[PDB]
Symmetry: D2
Subunit: 248 residues, 4 copies
């Protein structure tokens, strides 16, 4: 029983590092052609080159700043000149602009909404063509346990991660007749190189909230995304899969 994606093209936004990069590497490991995006076109192309060398797949990197509608449509013009179209979309790009509510600036609130909700809206609208035409497509939106539980200092981020669930369920209903499945993965506390700036004390505090007693790895999140893009998830749509070690 193997999962193979040879012949498919996957676009993973915000994949020059962290969870997004693990997701693109995981899809590449299953045979998928992959499109890497980052706010830096140079870094995106560099990462795409590394992934192609490591797994031997066709990979392309494009600059895409989800704060700009122009940057997004422009990245897609480049994308459609490189591939026939997109079969799999993983809306991973997302930002935080943390601040206690009473003092959150309008810009901190709006940028988070602009990238996490509007950027996801635009990227998804631009990726549907081939999927609807062939009646096969997979869209996976990366949400967060915080969109379900709420989190102090992240009212903007939590609002968007919960909003993505409404986005996922509504879009899944609209696209279901075309066999394009739309789902969400909600990671809990995942270890990335950024976790390195946390004090041992704060980290143990977070781990205490986790029944498995450990942070998950980016690859463990990527594995669930891979499952949703596989033939094993053909009857799942409009669903959220929590990957948080038992925390919620």
């Amino acid at each position: 029983m193997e999962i193979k994606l040879q012949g498919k093209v996957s676009l993973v936004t915000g994949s020059t590092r962290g969870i997004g990069r693990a997701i693109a590497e995981k899809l590449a490991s299953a045979g998928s052609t992959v499109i890497i995006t980052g706010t830096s076109g140079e870094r995106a192309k560099a990462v795409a080159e590394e992934i192609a060398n490591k797994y031997g797949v066709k990979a392309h990197g494009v600059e895409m700043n989800l704060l700009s509608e122009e940057s997004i449509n422009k990245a897609f013009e480049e994308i459609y000149n490189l591939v026939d179209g997109i079969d799999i979309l993983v809306n991973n790009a997302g930002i935080t602009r943390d601040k206690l509510f009473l003092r959150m600036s309008l810009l901190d609130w709006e940028e988070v909404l602009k990238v996490n909700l509007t950027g996801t809206f635009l990227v998804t609208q631009n990726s549907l063509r081939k999927m609807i035409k062939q009646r096969w497509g997979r869209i996976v939106n990366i949400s967060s346990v915080v969109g379900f539980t709420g989190n102090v200092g992240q009212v903007n981020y939590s609002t968007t991660k919960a909003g993505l669930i409404g986005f996922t369920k509504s879009l899944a209903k609209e696209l279901a007749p075309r066999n394009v499945l739309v789902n969400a993965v909600a990671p809990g506390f995942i270890e990335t190189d950024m976790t390195a700036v946390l004090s041992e004390e704060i980290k143990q505090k977070y781990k205490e909230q986790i029944p498995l007693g450990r942070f998950g790895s980016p690859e463990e999140v990527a594995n669930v995304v891979l499952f949703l893009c596989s033939e094993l998830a053909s009857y799942i749509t409009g669903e959220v899969i929590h990957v948080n070690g038992g925390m919620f």
Copy 2:
């Protein structure tokens, strides 16, 4: 067992008609001073006057266009010159721009998020002062059953109604230490004057999804808001109360 709000001041956005107006009248019937808002200041002041004559409460109407930060600030400058501060905030104002996803324009999407999420954000930030200082306050966010089930033609609206849940849960956590409770009410299918433009045909349809076999009235939603503003809801925060006749 009496629910009384005499001495309290309630701001209900988008209350010149529909559910918003029913909420403002319900709070006034319990003795609350009320602030009515609408895109038409003239209309808001007129409604405030009718409510004041009907229930005998102190009422004020102010123009507030949630799409405009300047309008919001100007409304609050007027409010704080009329009232000592706000004890109760009901975030009811919201819009829909229904379109199938494949037919949705960036403005159809951005306008709905700007009013429903960003307008709610700004109104809430501006209404907290008195609640926090006195360690008592109630914020009720009006979501919708479609933020939970998703709905065809409403990917934008459903995203915002789901987003208000993450907003509610996160804000509830940040303000809980100050005893300011933040909850949401998620109405199902409610009969308003906007409902008459639908066929008796399409209405019987919608009713098919409702176990109680009938649409709810605006007053039935308003009654739940009243409950959340009362002493009976003193240990409830970060919660969503579904008022949908058993459909979800």
Copy 3:
């Protein structure tokens, strides 16, 4: 705005103390006739008398052991010889038999299910007659936040509290056409006399999980039950109201 239940008859199981008693007193304070039940008929009649003297309502106490179908039937035979019928049922009686799963005996498991689910089933079947005939009735099931989050040492109890949600949602659908509303209240950590046997140590701990920073009182849970039995909850059915200070 007055919540009055004069002329209504409420059966509250397991109401000789704790949350059950607070619920019965709260309903009596709104004018309801109340029926108190306990494993000790003598104790139930005594409590009924105290409540009757304190609020001036018609109150009756009956012995009801939910583990025993014969006890249940005998209690209802007595009830229908004292009251015309039941308008409001609060399924509050329940037990815990805490054990780590690997240490749980079949009786630790079966007793908890027999009382919490099967006893609730039988009491409810026996209380519907008047509600159905008159097209008005309210059934409130007391669940618990652990039925939602799960809890170590409580696999049996959590199974029953989660089960009461499916019970509530299904029964709500079957009775909705008759206007008999079925809802659940899921208290978080509530301070009762059973609480004093815990260390100030372990209590401060539990409080750590609570945003409001305090345990709720039995009266705060009772107030929510009262709300569900009032005219303010006429469009709510098949719903769970969490009363946990923001923990879930």
Copy 4:
């Protein structure tokens, strides 16, 4: 990227037909040794023989009537004489005893609870030994969309399917420190040979509730169970994965 279970032993209850048989065949297809159970030991051994011939795996059939604690412990004595122990448990066995509530017999209620909750409790307790010892184990409980939405005529079944979620989350927390993951799969409307007795009319009615517009196949449910038993689900525990074509 392949999923292989060679060397592992999987017990699937109620696997002589339908979804349970698809699940056992799917695990066998990935290389797992499989234990088939049914109320008829003869049919269980026959199915096990067929699966072993089709996939070439070690397979064993045992009679197990979940209505009897004696039958269950006895099946396990046979099981432990055939395999070192159990690495994967799929609690699939479940029954319905449909009846409108007001007229449901106590036996219809209790049998459903006895098999779906108590049988699952006992089977799970008997299967943990090897898992806890080696710090690797996967338990998958088959729930149902009806445990979440409720369903007319199935208050007993819905109660148990929702109860299994509390069971899953509590047990996941207790076993997480041992790396034994406990999850649930909630199928929606799945086509089995029993679906053959439904009128074309009723079936179209059900399909109308499904966005994908079709029933899922037993194999599509089995695929999700396989995912949860794979290395791709190593950070998932205490979760429910809905497999219902977008219905909920």
